[PDB]
Design a protein around this nucleic acid. Structure first.
Lengths: 47, 89, 141, 180
RNA sequence: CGGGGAAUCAGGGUUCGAUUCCGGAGAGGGAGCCUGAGAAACGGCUACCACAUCCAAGGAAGGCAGCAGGCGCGCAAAUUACCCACUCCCGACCCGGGGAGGUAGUGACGAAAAAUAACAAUACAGGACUCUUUCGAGGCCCUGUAAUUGGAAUGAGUCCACUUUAAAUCCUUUAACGAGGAUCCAUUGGAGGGCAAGUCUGGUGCCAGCAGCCGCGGUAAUUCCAGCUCCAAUAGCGUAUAUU
């Protein structure tokens, strides 16, 4: 149990460390690389 | 020759010395011979005494088998942030 | 339930043998196709010649490449995949050599990580792989 | 066709559970008390005891006035008395079942050298037994498993050819005495 | 090939039996004979089939599923030794012959016994007991560990002599030399659970690999590979297959 329970706690810790958002940044990078957008200039208004 | 690992991949890392247990690939310009073929390695020790070092077989002959020489450069990180480091030397 | 009289012997014995043909281990011993499809032909060991080297992919949660060999038996000519046991021993096996091949240990069932490979090489060129891996003997050719 | 016999028996049975703590405990304890080479000696004595107990179990089931039960049981009780295990008071086939392994291990010539004062350690008893220093009546026995009988228990001696016995000191005394 | 029987096994049973004893069958395959009390005999004959030896090319000769030996097949199995002294058999026979048989050689098939160290004094380390608040100190206390010291006792070996024996060999019996562990040195598997014995140290880093099964490896690897320590059996111990 001790060894298993220790590995399970390691699993919960690694699951908490495995987790503009990065997904939106990746989508913007994919859209720029696809030729739809030439370059991202800046942010105009933050709502 | 040039000594390399005997793996299945394309690139082969160059070995700068002969290992006593790992089986290596000696690669050199040579007259072409069709495998299988027994291969022997000798060296002049002193006064013309041929000493045996290594032995094996002849693998396929091709110039496309590239050998890659590596160099790793070391650095001591003297400042550590979280996931960020400042390294010198 | 059961026929349980005193003159009921041949019915009971016929029932025993008829139902015993539904036993998997008994049928595997006695249908006789499990000894005619068996590559070793009911032998503890076979001897073969190496046809090619093979890298068998590991099964899902285990991530590795297992170093196997396609050998051909001398006695019937069948094609068999055999697993070279220890680390760094596939280099001892050279192309077209005499290999002494055994079972892997589960009696026809594939063992452990390697899928569908149920044999392991014990000896190469009549020198054991255990001696070569331990660096005790030298492999001729 | 040959003029030979191939009849032979294995004198031990290995235990079915290979590593259980209490079994290894008991065997190691007996190894310590009676000074033995390996676990096969303990297994051998346990197997002989199992033979005797199995014979007694086959003999109890018969009727009391069975001639076979009478003859076989009285012979077995005579045999176990002459070894030095049972007692003249308890010469009944019921009491044969109440026997223990050390009651057979106490009868080895190793332990009989140890207890009677011929030696001073049980490993010392073994090393005297192997080196032809202990005799029984008039025969030098070299085997430390000789089961000593009751009439034979009384006189165990120094094996007169031995340096501890009659005379002729060994090679070490002879060499050191000729140093100067 | 059948049986006597073998292994296991509470009771019931399951599996095996080519194999030294008994009965049967066959001498490459079939067939037919001679002689004799006894043979459809093959270390007898005649044919055909299949192999195969010597030729002067006209012909001649075969039969190791007897003993040794070879090829071949294989995962798989020994000496082209010695002798009729034992056991018995054969003959015209107190005499001759016997690869029947015996005897040595190869033999870790399997089986039985059984060495690889014993004692004493010191030197430490612990454990209890007594005296001491404790720290500490003692014992005619215990338990360990010591390439520590002392002596004695031995066998493996080399070698004589005898015995053994058909002549030998071996075992047994004697003289001679022969033992301080830093060798006359014990291995084979293992240390995640099942399953005994390490969350010890270094290397490789979901690679290489390990692992019967469950699983481990993705950086503090309890599982890989080494060292140290330790466990299991012990002159034996791993694996594969068949069967219980």
């Amino acid at each position: 149990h001790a060894y298993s329970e220790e590995r399970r706690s390691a699993r919960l810790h690694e699951k908490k460390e495995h987790s503009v958002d990065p997904k939106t940044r990746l989508l913007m990078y994919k859209m720029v690389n696809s030729g739809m957008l030439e370059t991202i200039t800046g942010c105009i208004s933050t709502g | 020759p040039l000594f390399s690992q005997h793996t299945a991949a394309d690139k082969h890392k160059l070995q700068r010395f002969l290992t006593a247990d790992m089986a290596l690939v000696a690669t050199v310009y040579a007259p072409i011979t069709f495998p299988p073929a027994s291969v022997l390695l000798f060296k002049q020790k002193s006064n013309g005494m041929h000493s045996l070092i290594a032995t094996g077989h002849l693998m396929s002959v091709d110039p496309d088998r590239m050998v890659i020489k590596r160099v790793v450069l070391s650095g001591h990180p003297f400042k550590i942030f979280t996931k960020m480091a400042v390294v010198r030397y | 339930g059961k026929c349980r009289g005193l003159r009921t012997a041949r019915k009971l014995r016929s029932h025993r043998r008829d139902q015993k043909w539904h036993d998997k281990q008994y049928k595997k011993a006695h249908l006789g196709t499990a000894l005619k499809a068996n590559p070793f032909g009911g032998a503890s060991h076979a001897k073969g010649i190496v046809l090619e080297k093979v890298g068998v992919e590991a099964k899902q949660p285990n991530s590795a490449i297992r170093k196997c060999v396609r050998v051909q038996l001398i006695k019937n000519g069948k094609k068999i995949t055999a697993f070279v046991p220890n680390d760094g021993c596939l280099n001892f096996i050279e192309e077209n050599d005499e290999v002494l091949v055994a079972g892997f240990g589960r009696k026809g069932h594939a063992v452990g990580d390697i899928p569908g490979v149920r044999f392991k090489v014990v000896k190469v060129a009549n020198v054991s792989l255990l001696a070569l891996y331990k660096g005790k003997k030298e492999r001729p050719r | 066709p040959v003029a030979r016999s191939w009849v032979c028996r294995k004198t031990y049975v290995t235990p079915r559970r290979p590593f259980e703590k209490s079994r290894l405990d008991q065997e190691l304890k007996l190894i310590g008390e009676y000074g033995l080479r390996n676990k096969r000696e303990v297994w051998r004595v346990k197997f002989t005891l199992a033979k005797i107990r199995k014979a007694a179990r086959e003999l109890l089931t018969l009727d009391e006035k069975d001639p076979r039960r009478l003859f076989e049981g009285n012979a077995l009780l005579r045999r176990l008395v002459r070894i030095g295990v049972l007692d003249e008071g308890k010469m009944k086939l019921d009491y044969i079942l109440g026997l223990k392994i050390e009651d057979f291990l106490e009868r080895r010539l190793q332990t009989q050298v140890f207890k009677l004062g011929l030696a001073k350690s049980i490993h010392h008893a073994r090393v005297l037994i192997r080196q032809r220093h202990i005799r029984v009546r008039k025969q030098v026995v070299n085997i430390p498993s000789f089961i000593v009988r009751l009439d034979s228990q009384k006189h165990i001696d120094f094996s007169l050819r031995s340096p501890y016995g009659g005379g002729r000191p060994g090679r070490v005394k002879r060499k050191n005495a000729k140093k100067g």
